Design an enzyme around this catalytic site. Structure first.
Site, PDB file in Angstrom:
ATOM      1  N   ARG A  43      32.265  50.718  47.528  1.00  0.00           N
ATOM      2  CA  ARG A  43      33.635  50.262  47.188  1.00  0.00           C
ATOM      3  C   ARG A  43      33.920  50.603  45.726  1.00  0.00           C
ATOM      4  O   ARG A  43      33.050  50.384  44.869  1.00  0.00           O
ATOM      5  CB  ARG A  43      33.795  48.766  47.468  1.00  0.00           C
ATOM      6  CG  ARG A  43      35.144  48.178  47.063  1.00  0.00           C
ATOM      7  CD  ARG A  43      35.168  47.663  45.638  1.00  0.00           C
ATOM      8  NE  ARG A  43      36.364  46.891  45.353  1.00  0.00           N
ATOM      9  CZ  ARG A  43      36.549  46.153  44.266  1.00  0.00           C
ATOM     10  NH1 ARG A  43      35.628  46.125  43.317  1.00  0.00           N
ATOM     11  NH2 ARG A  43      37.659  45.446  44.135  1.00  0.00           N
TER      12      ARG A  43
ATOM     13  N   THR B 154      33.712  42.582  34.950  1.00  0.00           N
ATOM     14  CA  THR B 154      34.554  43.647  34.338  1.00  0.00           C
ATOM     15  C   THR B 154      34.784  43.309  32.873  1.00  0.00           C
ATOM     16  O   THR B 154      34.918  42.127  32.541  1.00  0.00           O
ATOM     17  CB  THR B 154      35.891  43.796  35.064  1.00  0.00           C
ATOM     18  OG1 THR B 154      35.550  43.947  36.442  1.00  0.00           O
ATOM     19  CG2 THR B 154      36.717  44.958  34.561  1.00  0.00           C
TER      20      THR B 154
END
Ligand SMILES: [Cl-]
Ligand SMILES: [Cl-]
Ligand SMILES: [Cl-]
Ligand SMILES: [Cl-]
Ligand SMILES: [Mg+2]
Ligand code: NA
Ligand code: NA
EC number: 3.4.19.5
Lengths: 135, 158, 157, 135
Positions: free
Chosen positions: D29, D1
């Site tokens: 997900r 991220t």
């Protein structure tokens, strides 16, 4: 879009929201319904909320969580938080719709800024109230 | 305070000039039946989570409301369904978006919450997660209704 | 207040014991180059929105960081990428999730914000929207790196 | 991220977040990164936030919007809101990670509860700072 909020005899809050989206929707568009804090939120400390309306504005405004935060942090009543979000903040962003909300004290609110919202509510062991149009 | 339920079947431009009382009473009857089911569950000591799950499952099943059976049509005459459920006690939540082969999206959302560590699943991955856990695969057309197809044709003219 | 940028490349169990100084300097050099580009853009009067878009594009391009090139692998040895961008002035936002054929997810998120009436798009629908707006289709293979593949293999060995 | 937050010379805030998810992720997900108010939020009235960590907890706690609401409604400073969210609320729900934030007054915060967070910041015309580990 459809939804439900409840306070049970153990003092627990819950919320649920479900939708088919919009007629003629762009495939792959996601509105507020499946997004925690936008179309659905529950927290025993504050409120359970389910929303219906302009998905994009309910996401940008985090409408369901904003009810909770205005109450928990701002000290607003459920009625004041619902008025602020549905009648002031969402229209300021070009949003139309409404929501249902129950707080941990069992106060209920069904605000909407549209011509109608299919809705009903009732306390356990009482006669329910139903509505379509504005009062 | 007292145990209590509220439900909605959507907000928008619901026009009274275009409706008959008998047409309105079909919606009132459906809302009253579902809220009464929730009230009786709450009175019996059922959990708020089970009550909102069942109320939304019934609103999905009801063709009058745009969720599950009676879902609106996309631009491509398909159905794409989304749902969320949240437990205010644990602050756990489950959500699915963009599912086409699950009869009851709210039950798939509850399955994400209870049978995975996740909050949100999308598309084919969400469907495969549910199917691997015994949730039934349904024909993508089970949700289709003439009223919502006619609304798509009307939308295509505007 | 004075114009300012912050960036991140991910939080977690970053192990000093497992790192060499040369490995650490590769991350420091990448972070410093990207924050310096953002600072120069802000100094030159570029918008916060364009600055965060460009900074995240550069973090995507950098193979050291788990976004775009250098994305981790799923259980299926695939890549699934997600991004969001939000403008504090208009409160407009754009987001994509579950995209595999777009080189720069943050640019697809910006496309949802700027070139649609929507906030969030997912999967093939998001990709088809982006392709219709002229964004290039790439193979998901372009994101693959040996470092992240070896991490997947280590997790399942 | 990865992520970025900025305040420009016109006084505008913005945020962006991008991710590949997790090694060995279950296909389909979605974590906090693409979700408005969870992994990414900006509002000129309060703060710009980009998050990184255990996605599910950042969604359940609406981490990015919670920073904004604690400041806007609770009157917390950026530092106080960051401590409350990252060092108290997220750990209490079993979450790990951090975030970067800039408020409308140009205060910057890079809180994290993990061993590390790859991070950097700098004021326009000033010298940048980088970090990996805890101070
Ligand atoms: Cl407000
Ligand atoms: Cl009425
Ligand atoms: Cl209306
Ligand atoms: Cl350091
Ligand atoms: Mg200096
Ligand atoms: Na239905
Ligand atoms: Na990268």
């Amino acid at each position: 879009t459809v939804g439900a909020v409840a306070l049970d005899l153990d003092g627990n809050l819950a919320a649920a929201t479900s939708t088919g989206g919009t007629t003629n929707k762009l495939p792959g568009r996601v509105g507020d319904s499946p997004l925690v804090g936008a179309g659905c939120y529950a927290n025993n400390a504050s409120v359970a909320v389910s929303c219906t309306g302009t998905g994009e504005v309910f996401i940008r405004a985090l409408a369901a969580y904003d009810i909770a935060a205005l109450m928990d942090y701002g000290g607003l009543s459920l009625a004041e938080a619902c008025e602020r979000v549905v009648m002031e903040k969402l229209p300021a962003l070009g949003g139309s719709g409404g929501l249902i909300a129950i707080d941990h004290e069992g106060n209920v609110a069904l605000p909407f800024n549209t011509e109608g919202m299919y809705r009903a509510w009732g306390y356990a062991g009482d006669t329910p109230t139903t509505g379509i149009y504005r009062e | 305070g007292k145990a209590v339920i509220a439900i909605h079947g959507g907000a928008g431009a619901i026009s009274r000039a275009q409706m008959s009382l008998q047409q309105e009473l079909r919606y009132i009857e459906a809302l009253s039946a579902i809220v009464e089911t929730g009230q009786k569950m709450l009175e019996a000591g059922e959990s708020a989570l089970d009550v909102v799950t069942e109320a939304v499952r019934l609103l999905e099943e009801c063709p009058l409301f745009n969720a599950g059976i009676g879902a609106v049509f996309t631009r491509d005459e398909t159905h794409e369904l989304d749902a969320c459920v949240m437990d205010g006690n644990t602050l756990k939540a489950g959500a699915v978006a963009g599912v086409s082969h699950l009869r009851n999206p709210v039950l798939a959302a509850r399955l994400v919450m209870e049978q995975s560590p996740h909050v949100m699943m999308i598309g084919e991955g969400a469907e495969n997660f549910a199917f691997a856990r015994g949730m039934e695969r349904v024909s993508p057309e089970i949700f289709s209704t003439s009223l919502r197809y006619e609304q798509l044709l009307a939308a295509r003219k505007e």
